[PDB]
């Protein structure tokens, strides 16, 4: 559950739950509906931290997109350190790009979401992938640590 495939299909589903679209084959998976609700809480107060820093922003393009993504990442990963909490905040902040380009895309396209999970899942497979298959995966680490007791 570290390959690629996997971590896009959960980027894609957080994208599709912050744009109010589930895609109705199958449903989200055990790890998808966990994530889902711990990375949508994250978000509303990183939405509220980062309020002065996101004003000041136009998120005109997938490219202003990266770039804001990166400067929070490198950031919050600069230390070495990598943990769960760590994690879901990727999720939580690709859910603001996505509303922020919602409202402020220069030329809106509806597969725009399907590029920003892409290059998360690209982010968190290179910088995190082999953190999270020591400690567990998403179903033996992550759905463990944050399931309800
Ligand atoms: C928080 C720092 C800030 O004001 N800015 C504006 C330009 C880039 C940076 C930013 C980073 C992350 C989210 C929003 C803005």
Same mark, same amino acid.
């Given at each position: 559950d570290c390959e690629f495939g996997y971590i896009y299909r959960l980027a894609q589903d957080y994208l599709q739950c912050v744009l109010q %679209?589930?895609?109705p084959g199958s449903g989200p998976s055990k790890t998808s509906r966990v994530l889902q609700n711990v990375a949508f809480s994250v978000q509303? $107060? +990183?939405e509220k931290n980062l309020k002065s820093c996101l004003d000041n922003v136009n998120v005109v393009?997938? *490219? !202003?997109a990266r770039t804001l993504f990166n400067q929070v990442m490198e950031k919050e990963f600069? *230390? @070495? %350190? %990598?943990?769960? @909490?760590?994690? +879901? !905040? %990727?999720?939580a902040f690709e859910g603001i790009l996505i509303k922020k380009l919602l409202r402020q895309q220069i030329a809106p396209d509806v597969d725009t979401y399907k590029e920003i999970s892409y290059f998360v899942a690209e982010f968190i497979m290179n910088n995190t992938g082999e953190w999270i298959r020591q400690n567990g995966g998403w179903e033996n680490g992550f759905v463990k640590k944050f $399931?309800?007791?």
């Amino acid at each position: 559950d570290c390959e690629f495939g996997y971590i896009y299909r959960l980027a894609q589903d957080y994208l599709q739950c912050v744009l109010q %679209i589930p895609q109705p084959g199958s449903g989200p998976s055990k790890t998808s509906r966990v994530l889902q609700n711990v990375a949508f809480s994250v978000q509303k $107060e +990183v939405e509220k931290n980062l309020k002065s820093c996101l004003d000041n922003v136009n998120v005109v393009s997938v *490219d !202003t997109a990266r770039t804001l993504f990166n400067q929070v990442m490198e950031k919050e990963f600069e *230390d @070495g %350190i %990598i943990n769960w @909490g760590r994690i +879901v !905040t %990727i999720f939580a902040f690709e859910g603001i790009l996505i509303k922020k380009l919602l409202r402020q895309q220069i030329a809106p396209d509806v597969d725009t979401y399907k590029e920003i999970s892409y290059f998360v899942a690209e982010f968190i497979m290179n910088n995190t992938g082999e953190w999270i298959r020591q400690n567990g995966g998403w179903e033996n680490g992550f759905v463990k640590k944050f $399931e309800p007791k």
